[PDB]
Amino acid sequence: ARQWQPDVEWAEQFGGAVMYPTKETAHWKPPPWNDVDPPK
Amino acid sequence: TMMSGRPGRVPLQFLPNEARSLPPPKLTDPRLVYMGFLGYCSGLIDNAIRRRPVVSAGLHRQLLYVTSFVFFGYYLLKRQDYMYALRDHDMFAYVKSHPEDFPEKDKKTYGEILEEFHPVR
Amino acid sequence: SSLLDLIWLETILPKTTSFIQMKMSIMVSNQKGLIKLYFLSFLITIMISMTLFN
Amino acid sequence: NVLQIVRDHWVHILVPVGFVFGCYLDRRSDEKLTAFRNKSLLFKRELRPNEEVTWK
Amino acid sequence: PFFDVQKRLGLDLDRWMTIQSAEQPHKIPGRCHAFEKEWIECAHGIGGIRAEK
Amino acid sequence: AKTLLHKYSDIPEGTECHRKAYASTSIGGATGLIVSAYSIALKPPASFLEGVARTGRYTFTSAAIGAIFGLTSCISAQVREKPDDPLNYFIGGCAGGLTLGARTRSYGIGAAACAYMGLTAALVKMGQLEGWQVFAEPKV
Amino acid sequence: WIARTFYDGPEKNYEKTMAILQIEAEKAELRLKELEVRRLMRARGDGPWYQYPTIDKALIDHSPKTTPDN
Amino acid sequence: MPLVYMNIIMAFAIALAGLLMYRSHLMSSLLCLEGMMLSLFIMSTLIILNTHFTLANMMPIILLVFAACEAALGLSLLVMVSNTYGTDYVQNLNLLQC
Amino acid sequence: MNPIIYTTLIMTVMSGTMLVMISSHWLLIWIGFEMNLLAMIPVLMKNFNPRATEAATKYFLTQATASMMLMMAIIINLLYSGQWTITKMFNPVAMTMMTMALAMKLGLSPFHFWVPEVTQGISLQAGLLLLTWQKLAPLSVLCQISQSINPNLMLTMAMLSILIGGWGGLNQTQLRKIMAYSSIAHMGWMTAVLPYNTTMTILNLLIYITMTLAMFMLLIHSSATTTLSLSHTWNKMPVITSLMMVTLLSMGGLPPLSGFMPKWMIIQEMTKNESIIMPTLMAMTALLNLYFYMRLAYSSSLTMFPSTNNMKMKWQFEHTKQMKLLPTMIVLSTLVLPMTPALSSLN
Amino acid sequence: MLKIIIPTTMLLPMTWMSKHNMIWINATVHSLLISLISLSLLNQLGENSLNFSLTFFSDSLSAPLLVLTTWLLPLMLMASQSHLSKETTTRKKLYITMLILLQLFLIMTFTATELILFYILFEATLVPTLIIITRWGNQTERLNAGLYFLFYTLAGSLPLLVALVYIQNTTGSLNFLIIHYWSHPLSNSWSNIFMWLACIMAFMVKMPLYGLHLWLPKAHVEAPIAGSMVLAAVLLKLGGYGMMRITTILNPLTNYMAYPFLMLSMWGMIMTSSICLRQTDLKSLIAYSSVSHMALVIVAIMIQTPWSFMGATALMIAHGLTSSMLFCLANTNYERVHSRTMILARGLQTLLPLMATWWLVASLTNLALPPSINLIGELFIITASFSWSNITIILMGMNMMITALYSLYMLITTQRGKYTHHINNIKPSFTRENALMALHILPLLLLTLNPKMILGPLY
Ligand SMILES: CCCCCCCCCCCCCCCCC[C@@H](O)O[C@H](CO[C@H](O)CCCCCCCCCCCCCCC)COP(=O)(O)OCC[N+](C)(C)C
Ligand SMILES: CCCCCCCCCCCCCCCCC[C@@H](O)O[C@H](CO[C@H](O)CCCCCCCCCCCCCCC)COP(=O)(O)OCC[N+](C)(C)C
Ligand SMILES: CCCCCCCCCCCCCCCCC[C@@H](O)O[C@H](CO[C@H](O)CCCCCCCCCCCCCCC)COP(=O)(O)OCC[N+](C)(C)C
Ligand SMILES: CCCCCCCC/C=C\CCCCCCCC(=O)O[C@H](COC(=O)CCCCCCC/C=C/CCCCCCCC)COP(=O)(O)OCCN
C-alpha cells in the first residue's frame, strides 16, 4: 500500500570503506567524519 | 582543419575586420532565442537555489541574466559564422588552385549504367 | 521459464558482465596506498615505453 | 467575475497560442523553400493575369 | 593553448633567447650561426610540413 | 618491440607449424613477464623465492596459451587447405582458451575463456584480412 | 471543404521536396569535398590549413660578429 | 654525441631509478631529486658552452635557483611528516589510498 | 591562512598557468610549471591536518619528478637541435620523455595513482581547483606539440586512462575518489583525440570543466564528502539533489545532455581518420562511468534514505554564503547541446 | 509540424502555473486538444511524403505512430490520477512534466528527417522513462529494473552511433531522402557484416529480440501504470520504426543476415508464448505477450516484402492499443488488491461485470479475433512468411494456438470461478476506469473500419 523506500539495512550497504568488500580490505576503516586523525 | 596557423591571423582578436563583410545574425535568430531561454533558466535555478519564489523573486536579476546571455550569444554567433565562412573560402580556393586533384567526373545517365539486381525472395 | 529465461539468458549477458566488471574494479582499486609500489610501477612503465614504442 | 477568474484561468490560453504560433512558424519555414515555385517539370504553369505566385 | 600575447602587443618577452643567431651580447657568434641562419631563411613562412620535406 | 610480431607475420599461415608455435610462445612469454612485473611491483607477495615462483607460473601459463594457440591454428589451417579463413583462427583461440582453463583447473573459466579468446582471434584474423587499424594515423 | 480549409495542392509539397532535395544534395557534396580537401592539405601542407609554425626570419642578427666566419 | 654526454645521461637515469625505487626514507627521495637536478645542470652547461650559445648561459643559473627552491619546499614537507610520525619513513604515508 | 596571502597564492597559480600558455620558450614553460607547483602546495594544505599534509607531499613528489623529466626532455631536444621554441619536438624519445612527463602531470594512466589519494586528502575547494585549473597548462603544451606526438603512445595511455577510471570508480563510496576517477576517465577522452584534432580536445576540456565545477560547487553547498552524507541531503534541500542528479546524468554522456556533446564529436572526428575500433571501445568503457554515476543518483535523489532527528535543527537555518555562477554552471553543463556547432569558434 | 511540437511544449508552463487542484483537468483537456490537432497528420499521399521542412517530415508510417503517441498522453494522465493522490503538488507537476517531455521527444523522434537527430531523440527518450520507473515505483527492485532498462539499451545503441557517423563520412549525408535515392548495394564483407550488425542490434534490443528481452519483464513489472503504458504502447515500436527506416541501406546483405534473427524470433514467439501459460503474475504475462507480438513484427521486418511491411505497421499500432488496455485492467485490479498475483483475486465477473466485459474485449483483440486490426497484421505477416517459406506456417500456427490459450487463461483465472472469500474491499468501478477502457477500445474497433490509415506507405 506504500512505496518502498530504503531502510537502515539498505543504507548500510554504502557505508563501508569501499564497495564490494574483500578479505584484504575487510580491515579497512572509513575515514573520520572530519578529515582529522588523533595525533597519537 | 587546424586554422590556427592560417596566415594573416591576428593573435587575439575575437572578430577580425574582414568578418564585417558578412551579414550579422538577426535579432530574432533562433539561436539567440535559445540563448535567452538559457538565461531565463539560469535565473529560475538561481531563484530556486536561494529558496525564493522561483517565478517572481527577482525580475531585475532574471532580466540581467537574459540580457547577458543574449549579448554573449550574439557575439558568439558572429564569430561562429565567420569561422564557417573562412572554412568554405579556403575550401573553394584550394579546389580552384588544384584542378588536377578534383577532376570533373563524366556525367552519365542510368540508361547506360549496369547495376546488379538482387531479387528479394 | 526457468532454465533459459531466468537462468541461462541471465547468466550469459548481464551476470557475466556484472561479475567481470566487479572483479576488475576490485583488482584496480585494491591498492595499498604505498607510494613505493606506485613509483616502482612508474619505473616499469618508463622502461616499457622506452623499449616498446620506438 | 472578470479580472478575478482571469487570474485563475489564464493558463488555458497558452496552448491555443502555441498552436497558432506553430502555424505561423510553419508558414515562415515554407516561405524559405520557394526556390522551385512554378518551375517543376510536372507542375510548370503560366501565371494568371492577376497571379504573382502559384502557392503561398 | 598558446595565446600569442607577444605577437599581439609586440612585447618580446622571450623571443630574444630562442635561437643562436639573434643578437648575442657584444656580437658574439654562435658556433653554428651560418647553418642556422640558412635553415631559418629556408623555412620561413613555408609551414612545418613543407619545411620538414 | 615489434620484432617478434614481424617474425610471426613473416611465416606463411599454411606452413611452418614449428616456427609459428615458437614465435607465439615467445610472445606469450613476453606478455606473461610484463604482467608478472606489474603484479610484483604493485603487490610484493611475501619474499624473493615466492615472487620468482609466481613469475614462473605466470610466464609458463602465458607461454602455454600462445603455444597452443599457434599450434592449433596452424594445424587447422594446413588441414583445411583454406588459408585466410577466420574460423581456423577461432579454433586455435578456443584451444588456447581451453589450455588456460586446465592450468586454472576450473571448468567455468575454460568455457568462458574459450569463447572469448576464439572470438578475439577470429576478430584479429578479420582485421588482418580487411585492414582494420587499431591505432589509425591522422589522415585528415 | 476539408481540402479548401485545411490543406494545399500537390504542387506545393512537390516543389518544396525538390528544394529540400537540392539543398541536402549540395550539403552532401560539400561534405565529401571538405573531407578530400582536408586530407590533401594535411598531407601536403601547401594550403592555409595545417600550417605549423616556423622560426621567424626577422630574429636573425645580420651584423659583423667579431669573427669573419660568423 | 660523445661519451661525456652519455655518461651524464646514464647518471641521470640512475638517479631517476633510485628515486623511483623508494627503499625508505623520503629524505633519500629528495636526495635523488637533487642528484637529478645536478645531472641536468651539468648536461645543460656542457651543451650551452660547447655550442657557444651566449645568451643561454643564464639558463643553468635560473634552473639551479628554481629547483633549489623546490628542494626547500620538499624539505619543509618532510619536516611536517616527521613531526606527525617521528620518522620520515615512506610507509608511514598510507592514510590516503587508491 | 590570511585572506590576502590566499589571494596572492591563487593569483600566483593562475599566473604560472598563464605563463605556460603565453610563452614561446621552453625555459619559460618550465618556469611556469615550477611557479604553479610552488604556489599550489599551500592551497592544498589550507586546512591543516595529517591527511592534507600527506596529500601535499604526494603531489609535490609527483610534480617534481614530472618537472625533472620535462626539463630532461627539453635538454635532449636542445642537444639534438639548438632550439628553445615550443614547436616540433625534433627528436625521438626526447618526445617520449616529454609525453610521459606531461601525462604524469595530467594524471594519465599509468601515472594516475596519485590523483584519487591526493583528491581524497585535500578539501573540496582544493579538489575543485586541482581537478579543474591544473589541467589547463599540460593540455595547452600538448596541444602545441600535437603533431610531434607518436599516436600509439598517446592512444595507449588514453585507452588505459578510460579503462582505469571506469573500473576504479566502481569501488568507491567517497565522493572525492569518485571525482578523481571521473577526472582520469575524462582526461583519457581528452587525450585520445589530440593526434587528430586539438579543437575537440579544447571543447572536451571546456565541457568537463563546466560539469566538474557544477558538481564540486553542489558538493560544497550540500557539505557531503561521502555517499551516506549525500543521502541525507534530500531531507534539507531536495532541489540541490535534483540538480545534482541531472548533472550526474549529464556527466554520464546521456543525450540530450551537454555531456553527450564531447564524446559524440570526438567519436565523429576519429571516424574521419578511419579509426573505428577505438571509439567503440571508448564508449563501451564509458558505460562504467555511467553506471557509478547512476548508483550515486540512486543513493542521492531518486530514493529517500533514512535521516536523523538532529536534522530538524538544520531546517531552521539558511546558507550565509551563496555561490554565484552555480546556476550558470548547471545550465551550461546541462542544456547546451543545441548550440553544438558553436565549437567552430575554435573554443 | 511545429503546430504539434509547440503546443506540447506549452503544456509545460501550463502545468507548472496551474492550481494545486486543477493540474489534471488542464493537462487532460489540452492533451486531448493536441491529439485532435495531430489528427491532421493522417492525410497522406501515394507519393513520397509530407515534407514540412529541412528538419521534420511525415509519412504514412510516421503518421499512425504520431497519432497514437499524442492520443496516449490523456489516458496516461487519467490512469496516473489515482495512485498519485497523496503526492505533493510539486511532485505531481514533476510527473506530468516527465510525461510531457516523453511525448515531445517521441513526437520529434517520429519525424526526424535526419538519422543523427533521430538517434539523439531516440536516446533522449531514455531519461524520462528511467526517472519514471526508478522514482515512482512501488517495489524495491525498481532500481535494479531501471539499470537493466538503461544498459541493455545503451549496449545496443552505442555501436549504432559509430556506424551512423561512419556512413556520413562515406556517403556524405544521413538525410533519409538522399539515403533512399542514393542507395547502393552492400558487398558481402567482414566490414559490411559488422556495419549491418551495428545498424541492426540497436533496434533489435528494443523490440525486444528473444534473448535480449530480459530487461522488458523487469521494466514493465516495476514501472507505474503510465510507465507501463508508454513502454508497451510506443517505446517498443521505436525499434520497428528504426528498422523500417534503416534497412533501405542494408540490402542485399539483409537476406544473408536475416537467418540468425529470424530463427531467434520464429522460435522465440513460441517460447515466450509458452512462458505465458505458466505465469503467476499478470504484468509479467502481459509483458511476455508483448515480446511474442514484437517477435512476429521482427520477422515481418526481416522478410522485407510489401505485405510484410503493411502487416508489421498494423500489428504495431494494434499491439500498442491492446497492451496498453491490458495493463490498465491489471492496474485497476492491483489498486484494489495490492497483490499483482493472478490466482489471488478470482471470480471478479460476479462483482464487477462491466470491467469483466472490458476484460473480454481486450482479450479478444489480443487473441486476434477477426476482423480486428490485430488479425489484419497477423494475417498479412503470415501470408508474407508463407511466401518466404512454406514451413514457417507450422511455427506461426502453433503461436496462434498458444496465444488463444493464455489469453483466455488470463480471462478465466481472474474473471470466472468463485470469488475469493476473504476479500471484501472490491468497490464498484469508477467512471474514470470505465472511461479509460472505453477510450482504449473504441479507437481499435473504429480503425477496423479504415485499415488503410494504419497499413503504412506500401499500401
Ligand atoms: C459535418 C462535418 C463533418 C466533418 C467535421 C470536421 C471537423 C474537424 C475537426 C477536427 C479537425 C482537426 C484539425 C485538422 C487541421 C488542424 C491543424 C492544421 O492542419 O490546420 C490549421 C488550421 O486550423 C484551424 O484554423 C483551427 C482548427 C481547430 C479546430 C477545433 C475544433 C474543436 C474545438 C472545440 C472547442 C469547443 C468549445 C469550447 C468549450 C469549452 C492550419 O491550416 P492552414 O495552414 O490555415 O491552412 C491553409 C490552407 N490553404 C493554404 C489552402 C489556405
Ligand atoms: C559549457 C561550454 C563552455 C562554456 C565556457 C564559459 C562561456 C562564457 C565565456 C565568456 C567569453 C570568453 C571569450 C573571451 C573574449 C575574447 C577572447 C579572445 O581573445 O580569444 C579568441 C578566441 O575566442 C575564444 O577561444 C572563443 C571562446 C568561446 C567558447 C564557447 C564555445 C563552447 C562550445 C559550444 C557549447 C555551447 C555553449 C553556449 C553558451 C556558452 C582568440 O583566440 P586565439 O588566440 O586567436 O586562438 C587560441 C586558440 N587556439 C590556440 C586553439 C588556436
Ligand atoms: C450498443 C448499441 C448500438 C446502437 C447503434 C447501432 C448503429 C449501427 C452502426 C454500428 C456499426 C456499423 C458499421 C456501418 C458502417 C457505417 C460507417 C462507415 O460507413 O464509415 C466508414 C468511415 O469511418 C472512418 O473511416 C473510420 C473512423 C476512423 C477512426 C480514427 C479515430 C480518430 C480519433 C481516435 C484516436 C486515435 C487512436 C489510434 C491511433 C491510430 C467507412 O466509410 P467509407 O466507405 O470507407 O468512405 C467514407 C465516405 N466517403 C465515401 C465520402 C469517402
Ligand atoms: C545488449 C547487447 C547488444 C550489443 C550489440 C553490439 C554488437 C554490434 C556489432 C559490432 C559492433 C561494432 C561494429 C562496427 C561499427 C560499424 C563500423 C563500420 O561499419 O566499419 C567497419 C568496422 O569494422 C570493425 O571495426 C569491426 C571490429 C569489431 C570489434 C568489436 C567486436 C565486438 C564483438 C563482435 C562479435 C559479436 C557479433 C554479434 C553480437 C550480438 C550482440 C550480443 C569496417 O571497418 P573500416 O575501417 O571502415 O574498413 C574499411 C576499409 N576496408
Curated annotation (Swiss-Prot), chain H:
Keywords: Electron transport, Membrane, Mitochondrion, Mitochondrion inner membrane, NAD, Respiratory chain, Translocase, Transmembrane, Transmembrane helix, Transport, Ubiquinone. GO terms for cellular component: mitochondrial inner membrane; respiratory chain complex I. It is found in: Mitochondrion inner membrane. One of its GO terms (biological process) is ATP synthesis coupled electron transport. It is a multi-pass membrane protein. InterPro entries: NADH_UbQ_OxRdtase_chain4L/K, NUOK/Mnh_C1-like. Belongs to the complex I subunit 4L family. It comes from the Eukaryota. It catalyses: a ubiquinone + NADH + 5 H(+)(in) = a ubiquinol + NAD(+) + 4 H(+)(out). Core subunit of the mitochondrial membrane respiratory chain NADH dehydrogenase (Complex I) which catalyzes electron transfer from NADH through the respiratory chain, using ubiquinone as an electron acceptor. Part of the enzyme membrane arm which is embedded in the lipid bilayer and involved in proton translocation. One of its GO terms (molecular function) is NADH dehydrogenase (ubiquinone) activity. The chain crosses the membrane at residues 1-21, 29-49, 61-81. It comes from Sus scrofa (Pig). Its EC number is 7.1.1.2. The gene is MT-ND4L. Core subunit of respiratory chain NADH dehydrogenase (Complex I) which is composed of 45 different subunits. This is NADH-ubiquinone oxidoreductase chain 4L. It is an enzyme of class 7 (translocase).
From Swiss-Prot, chain I:
One of its GO terms (biological process) is reactive oxygen species metabolic process. Its main location: mitochondrion. Pfam families: NADH_dehy_S2_C, Proton_antipo_M. InterPro entries: Complex_I_Subunit_2, NADH_DH_su2_C, NADH_UbQ_OxRdtase_chain2, ND/Mrp_TM. GO terms for cellular component: mitochondrial inner membrane; respiratory chain complex I. It catalyses: a ubiquinone + NADH + 5 H(+)(in) = a ubiquinol + NAD(+) + 4 H(+)(out). One of its GO terms (molecular function) is NADH dehydrogenase (ubiquinone) activity. It is found in: Mitochondrion inner membrane. It is an enzyme of class 7 (translocase). It is a multi-pass membrane protein. Keywords: Electron transport, Membrane, Mitochondrion, Mitochondrion inner membrane, NAD, Respiratory chain, Translocase, Transmembrane, Transmembrane helix, Transport, Ubiquinone. Signal peptide: none annotated. Its EC number is 7.1.1.2. The chain crosses the membrane at residues 3-23, 25-45, 59-79, 89-109, 149-169, 178-198, 200-220, 237-257, 274-294, 325-345. Belongs to the complex I subunit 2 family. Core subunit of the mitochondrial membrane respiratory chain NADH dehydrogenase (Complex I) which catalyzes electron transfer from NADH through the respiratory chain, using ubiquinone as an electron acceptor. Essential for the catalytic activity and assembly of complex I. PANTHER family: NADH-UBIQUINONE OXIDOREDUCTASE CHAIN 2 (PTHR46552:SF1). Core subunit of respiratory chain NADH dehydrogenase (Complex I) which is composed of 45 different subunits. Interacts with TMEM242. This is NADH-ubiquinone oxidoreductase chain 2. It comes from Sus scrofa (Pig).
